[PDB]
């Protein structure tokens, strides 16, 4: 089922002035992976600081880092 890569948008992994703590890899659909968002020691994360991968799609949309 699904389509193309059986993994939630890898884009989330990369974030400007921030690092994502992925935890799933590249398993079928990846209906279990969990990524912990966190902004560098300058900007404070204010949103979906947490997103669980499922059915090749992240539960919550990528957030954003706000300057202190």
From Swiss-Prot:
Q: Where is the Sushi domain?
A: 6-67
Compartment(s): Cell membrane; Postsynaptic cell membrane; Cell projection, Dendrite; Perikaryon
Cysteine-cysteine disulfides = 8-53, 39-65
Q: In which tissues is it expressed?
A: Ubiquitously expressed in tissues including the forebrain, cerebellum, eye, atrium, ventricle, lung, stomach, small intestine, colon, liver, spleen, kidney, urinary bladder and skeletal muscle. Expressed at low levels in testis, and more highly in brain regions.
Quaternary state and partners of this protein? Answer: Heterodimer of GABBR1 and GABBR2. Homodimers may form, but are inactive. Interacts (via C-terminus) with ATF4 (via leucine zipper domain). Interacts with JAKMIP1.
Summary of the function given for this chain in its UniProt record = Component of a heterodimeric G-protein coupled receptor for GABA, formed by GABBR1 and GABBR2. Within the heterodimeric GABA receptor, only GABBR1 seems to bind agonists, while GABBR2 mediates coupling to G proteins. Ligand binding causes a conformation change that triggers signaling via guanine nucleotide-binding proteins (G proteins) and modulates the activity of down-stream effectors, such as adenylate cyclase.
| UniProt note: domains | Alpha-helical parts of the C-terminal intracellular region mediate heterodimeric interaction with GABBR2. The linker region between the transmembrane domain 3 (TM3) and the transmembrane domain 4 (TM4) probably plays a role in the specificity for G-protein coupling.
The UniProt similarity line reads: Belongs to the G-protein coupled receptor 3 family. GABA-B receptor subfamily.
Q: What is this protein called?
A: Gamma-aminobutyric acid type B receptor subunit 1
Q: Which residues of the full protein are shown?
A: 96 to 159 of 960
């Amino acid at each position: 089922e699904a389509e193309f890569v059986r993994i939630c948008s890898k884009s989330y992994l990369t974030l400007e002035n921030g690092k994502v703590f992925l935890t799933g890899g590249d398993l079928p659909a990846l209906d279990g992976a969990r990524v912990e968002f966190r902004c560098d020691p300058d900007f404070h994360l204010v949103g979906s600081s947490r997103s669980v991968c499922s059915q090749g799609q992240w539960s919550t949309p990528k957030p954003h880092c706000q300057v202190n």
